[PDB]
Amino acid sequence: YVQELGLSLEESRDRLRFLQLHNWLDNRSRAVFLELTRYSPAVGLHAAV
Amino acid sequence: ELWPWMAHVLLPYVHGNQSSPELGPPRLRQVRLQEALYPDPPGPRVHTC
Amino acid sequence: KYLKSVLRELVTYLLFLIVLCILTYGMMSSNVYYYTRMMSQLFLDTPVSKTEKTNFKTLSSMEDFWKFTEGSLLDGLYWKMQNRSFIFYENLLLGVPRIRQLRVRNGSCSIPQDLRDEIKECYDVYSVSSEDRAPFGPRNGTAWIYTSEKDLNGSSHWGIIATYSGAGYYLDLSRTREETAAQVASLKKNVWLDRGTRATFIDFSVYNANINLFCVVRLLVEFPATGGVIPSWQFQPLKLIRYVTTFDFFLAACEIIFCFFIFYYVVEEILEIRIHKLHYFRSFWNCLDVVIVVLSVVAIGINIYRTSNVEVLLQFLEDQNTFPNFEHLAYWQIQFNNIAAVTVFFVWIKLFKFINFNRTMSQLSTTMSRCAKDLFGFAIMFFIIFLAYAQLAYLVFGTQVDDFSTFQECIFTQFRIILGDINFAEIEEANRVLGPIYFTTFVFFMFFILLNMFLAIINDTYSEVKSDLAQQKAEM
Amino acid sequence: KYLKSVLRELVTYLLFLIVLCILTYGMMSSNVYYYTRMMSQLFLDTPVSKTEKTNFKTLSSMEDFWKFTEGSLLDGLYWKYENLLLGVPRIRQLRVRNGSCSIPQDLRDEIKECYDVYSVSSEDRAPFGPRNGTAWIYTSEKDLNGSSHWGIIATYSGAGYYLDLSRTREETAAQVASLKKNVWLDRGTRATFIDFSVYNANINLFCVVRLLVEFPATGGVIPSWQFQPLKLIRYVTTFDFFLAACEIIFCFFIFYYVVEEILEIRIHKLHYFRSFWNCLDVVIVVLSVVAIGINIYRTSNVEVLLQFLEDQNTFPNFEHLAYWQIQFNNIAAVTVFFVWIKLFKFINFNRTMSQLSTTMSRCAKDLFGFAIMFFIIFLAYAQLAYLVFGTQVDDFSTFQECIFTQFRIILGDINFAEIEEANRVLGPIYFTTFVFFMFFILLNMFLAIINDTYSEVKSDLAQQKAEM
Numbered sequence A: 001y002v003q004e005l006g007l008s009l010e011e012s013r014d015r016l017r018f019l020q021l022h023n024w025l026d027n028r029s030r031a032v033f034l035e036l037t038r039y040s041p042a043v044g045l046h047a048a049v
Numbered sequence B: 001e002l003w004p005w006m007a008h009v010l011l012p013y014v015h016g017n018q019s020s021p022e023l024g025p026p027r028l029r030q031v032r033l034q035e036a037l038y039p040d041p042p043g044p045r046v047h048t049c
Numbered sequence C: 001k002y003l004k005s006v007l008r009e010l011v012t013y014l015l016f017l018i019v020l021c022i023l024t025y026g027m028m029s030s031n032v033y034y035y036t037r038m039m040s041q042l043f044l045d046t047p048v049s050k051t052e053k054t055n056f057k058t059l060s061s062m063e064d065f066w067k068f069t070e071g072s073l074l075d076g077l078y079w080k081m082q083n084r085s086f087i088f089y090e091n092l093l094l095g096v097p098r099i100r101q102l103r104v105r106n107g108s109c110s111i112p113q114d115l116r117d118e119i120k121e122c123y124d125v126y127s128v129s130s131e132d133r134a135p136f137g138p139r140n141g142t143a144w145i146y147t148s149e150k151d152l153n154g155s156s157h158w159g160i161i162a163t164y165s166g167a168g169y170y171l172d173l174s175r176t177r178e179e180t181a182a183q184v185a186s187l188k189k190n191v192w193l194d195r196g197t198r199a200t201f202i203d204f205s206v207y208n209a210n211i212n213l214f215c216v217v218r219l220l221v222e223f224p225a226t227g228g229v230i231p232s233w234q235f236q237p238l239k240l241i242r243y244v245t246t247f248d249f250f251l252a253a254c255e256i257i258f259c260f261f262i263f264y265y266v267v268e269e270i271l272e273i274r275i276h277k278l279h280y281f282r283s284f285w286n287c288l289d290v291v292i293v294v295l296s297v298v299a300i301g302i303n304i305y306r307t308s309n310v311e312v313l314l315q316f317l318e319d320q321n322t323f324p325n326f327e328h329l330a331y332w333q334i335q336f337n338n339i340a341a342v343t344v345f346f347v348w349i350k351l352f353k354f355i356n357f358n359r360t361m362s363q364l365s366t367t368m369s370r371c372a373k374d375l376f377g378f379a380i381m382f383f384i385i386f387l388a389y390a391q392l393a394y395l396v397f398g399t400q401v402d403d404f405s406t407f408q409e410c411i412f413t414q415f416r417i418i419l420g421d422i423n424f425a426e427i428e429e430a431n432r433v434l435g436p437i438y439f440t441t442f443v444f445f446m447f448f449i450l451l452n453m454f455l456a457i458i459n460d461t462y463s464e465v466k467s468d469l470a471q472q473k474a475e476m
Numbered sequence D: 001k002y003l004k005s006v007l008r009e010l011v012t013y014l015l016f017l018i019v020l021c022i023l024t025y026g027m028m029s030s031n032v033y034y035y036t037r038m039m040s041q042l043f044l045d046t047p048v049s050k051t052e053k054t055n056f057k058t059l060s061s062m063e064d065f066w067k068f069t070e071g072s073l074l075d076g077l078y079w080k081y082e083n084l085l086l087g088v089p090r091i092r093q094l095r096v097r098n099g100s101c102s103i104p105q106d107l108r109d110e111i112k113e114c115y116d117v118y119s120v121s122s123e124d125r126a127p128f129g130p131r132n133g134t135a136w137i138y139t140s141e142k143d144l145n146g147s148s149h150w151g152i153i154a155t156y157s158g159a160g161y162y163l164d165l166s167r168t169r170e171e172t173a174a175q176v177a178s179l180k181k182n183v184w185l186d187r188g189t190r191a192t193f194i195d196f197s198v199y200n201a202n203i204n205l206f207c208v209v210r211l212l213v214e215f216p217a218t219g220g221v222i223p224s225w226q227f228q229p230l231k232l233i234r235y236v237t238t239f240d241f242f243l244a245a246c247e248i249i250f251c252f253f254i255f256y257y258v259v260e261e262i263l264e265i266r267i268h269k270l271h272y273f274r275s276f277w278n279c280l281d282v283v284i285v286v287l288s289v290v291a292i293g294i295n296i297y298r299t300s301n302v303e304v305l306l307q308f309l310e311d312q313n314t315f316p317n318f319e320h321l322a323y324w325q326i327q328f329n330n331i332a333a334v335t336v337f338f339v340w341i342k343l344f345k346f347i348n349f350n351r352t353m354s355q356l357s358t359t360m361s362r363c364a365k366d367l368f369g370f371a372i373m374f375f376i377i378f379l380a381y382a383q384l385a386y387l388v389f390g391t392q393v394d395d396f397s398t399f400q401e402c403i404f405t406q407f408r409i410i411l412g413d414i415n416f417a418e419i420e421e422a423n424r425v426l427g428p429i430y431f432t433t434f435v436f437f438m439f440f441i442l443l444n445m446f447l448a449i450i451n452d453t454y455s456e457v458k459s460d461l462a463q464q465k466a467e468m
């Protein structure tokens, strides 16, 4: 089960509060797996975080 | 501690006037395990899952 | 006779050795280590503020740098006497500090058209071909206007990441804290370190008249194009008013005597070229005198160059309200120290020519000389596999371990493995599969299979030499 | 016929060795170690004040010293660590005068004062400040009962400006406050000595404390300390009677041994010093005579120490006992070591031990010959490291430090994190070449020499014995 974390500060924080107070990471909850990306244009390299 | 963690460092990092190269929004794909477990005896563990 | 040739060459060399050792004792004083140690502890090892705990050598952000500049920096530079500033009530801060910035220009790199929408601007890595040269921000003073290298009397530095230039945007701080703080606050207000900055230098110097010994200080933080901050430092205790005491005159006389000895060695080595045998370079005892002579001549030339251009001190002393530019002398001092150290090492090595006074030493010398060819033959096969392991480690782990970050680091890490210093606690997580395999296989094949061949060769050669010289005596 | 003589010397030596071992086990109790550790924890580890985090080991300025002498020192000196002070503490200062330099003419107008490094030829003798008694008037070394110290920077005299504190905190604090109100620690002060004595009747063990804080010419503070416990009762149990009997027996043994040595040297008028077993005995008897002389000197002067539990007001100069008490330990340790070494003379009659000793004997000329070749390169490398890293690494700060750091590198106790950053070239070159030329080349010659000598000795011994 995956969420999108929003696109701006206000919506991101709103979503975080909404899922926190509605029992998202409260149950068994084996793992969370936060992972996004990155790009570096100065050198031309990527990074998988 | 994950909620404060995303509150103070992750959210300022993902969005803002700095660290512009991002190349895609993040994710929070979590796993369930369907087998809610009672808390284990606190302290030194057998180290086996 | 033959006793008047091997003994004259000994007495003419012992005097050279004692003169060189006198100079060596003269250079390295015991009042130098504590000077540098206290300065370093004052500037690098103090927290930027009473709340944070990040000192200079643990900077992690560009915002921490602004906490250091108006913070533990000004707290150390300016001291109230118990007007001029004495850093420890002993070390005089002479002149005014200088802070200089190196920056690049937007659009030096190209973002691909596929994702050109989200990326607005990019800044390339530092290179003199892509260095900004235009005014920025409020174009009022000299901190917002490019100035050439010739107009700063600067030079390259060879930092950790790149080799920075000597030109940039500089600003001279003040003689009192109440003005330097205002200047730095004005610099911080109108953003002066934006995303385009690539390096930032801070320079100043001190005197400490109690023992006549200057000390130049340089602090460098460089922001790579991939983010982060890399701090660096340098403290060099110069000495520019040398002729003050009697011991200085004695050392000058010793240098003159050393120059005469080098001239004598030059003539007495060129006498054995054309007057006598030529191309006699398969000896290793005449290929070492040329090295000593060349290094000594280079050291004499370097000393003459670095003591014949001292006009910076007189220029500063004429007007003592400007920045003293001592950054060039501190480079030639380092080069002179390196050359003198190597020359001393080789002069000490040359002593082996004159220890053959009995059989028990001639046997060891012959044993060392007869196994040199075999050891050289095996060292090639050893070092080929050594370099193969080094490059394998560099390509596999060289991105996430730090210890294998560069080829030299791989070589030194493998040497420390041979010493048994480093352990594989961090290699394993870098690669689960090739972590332990590399360590165990390297230890197995370079600790008691290919490392014991040197022992075998040396033991066998020594036994053979002793047997041969014993059998030679068994016919008398 | 010689077997009985061998047994005679063996039994005499065994009696001597057991007497020596029991006497040295009698002089090493476990109270001194714990007492020194607790005293150090009380006086050093405790912070200067509850609002600061700097103890005595982390002095960094003069104001910190002034805070310490009113904080932890008074706290641990008159405690609520159950020891009791005897006499009165003394605080002393050594300073130089306002000129040593021929300050350069170039910038003579900007700097007005010099205070060079400490030297007896550059020491201040005039009175300074509010001239009042002892704290502000020079007192010569002879009149001050003092002597040299050999601190960390230099060696300090015994003279200086001294003041004796009091027996109660309430006015010792007042004295220190008076010394602080006036500027008693100018820029010219080069070192400061604090010392006192304690008894701790709970466990019968005196202690002599010295605390030295010295200010180099370049600013800063280098603290140092010295705790030495003493025991000057020597009568608590009849076990001390056993120790006295053992000492008398040891004196008789040494008298007998010097008699035997003089007989054996009158038999051999010369050439008697080329056996290594006729020479070791001379070292044994010489060191034993020195030890007995030091012990009698140190036990003769005890009456001064006992008459200070009477709550009087004078400084007990116990610096002399705490020095001979250390020299006695140093001499006794070497005596015990050499006596234990001398046992090889007797167990060398077993055939295998005889073979091993012969192997050592017939390769000692090659090992010493190769040691010179080893140490020439060792000293060249050490001096190169001293010249390159001598101001930045603290392991190469002085020459003998370079020697010991290289010896530690041989075992594999290097860090290399600060050698490389000290010098990015000639830093790694030195390390790599040193490791190569020691581990791969030079340290194998010792093995080759020992192996070859052992093999040829065994072959010769077997061949010679086979003729029977």
Ligand SMILES: *[C@@H]1O[C@H](CO)[C@@H](O)[C@H](O)[C@H]1NC(C)=O
Pocket (backbone or CB within 6 Å): C106, C107, C120, C121
């Ligand atoms: C740098 O130039 C790019 C165009 O190449 C532009 O989009 C960007 O805004 C410029 N940066 C600033 C600070 O104006």
Ligand SMILES: *[C@@H]1O[C@H](CO)[C@@H](O)[C@H](O)[C@H]1NC(C)=O
Pocket (backbone or CB within 6 Å): C138, C139, C140, C141
């Ligand atoms: C330059 O600095 C001066 C300092 O007073 C001030 O006027 C302003 O910050 C800058 N700009 C101009 C135009 O002076």
Ligand SMILES: *[C@@H]1O[C@H](CO)[C@@H](O)[C@H](O)[C@H]1NC(C)=O
Pocket (backbone or CB within 6 Å): C151, C152, C153
């Ligand atoms: C560079 O050196 C010259 C003297 O040759 C001096 O006049 C000038 O001020 C120096 N440059 C700077 C920026 O101070």
Ligand SMILES: *[C@@H]1O[C@H](CO)[C@@H](O)[C@H](O)[C@H]1NC(C)=O
Pocket (backbone or CB within 6 Å): D098, D099, D112, D113
């Ligand atoms: C130190 O001596 C210099 C000249 O010898 C004098 O000008 C200065 O006032 C003296 N300072 C003190 C504190 O005595």
Ligand SMILES: *[C@@H]1O[C@H](CO)[C@@H](O)[C@H](O)[C@H]1NC(C)=O
Pocket (backbone or CB within 6 Å): D130, D131, D132, D182
């Ligand atoms: C010095 O001694 C005099 C007389 O003994 C006394 O009046 C004066 O207060 C003393 N100085 C100080 C600082 O107490």
Ligand SMILES: *[C@@H]1O[C@H](CO)[C@@H](O)[C@H](O)[C@H]1NC(C)=O
Pocket (backbone or CB within 6 Å): D142, D143, D144, D145
């Ligand atoms: C120092 O001088 C002699 C040393 O024998 C002695 O009479 C005197 O009491 C000693 N102590 C002093 C003067 O405090």
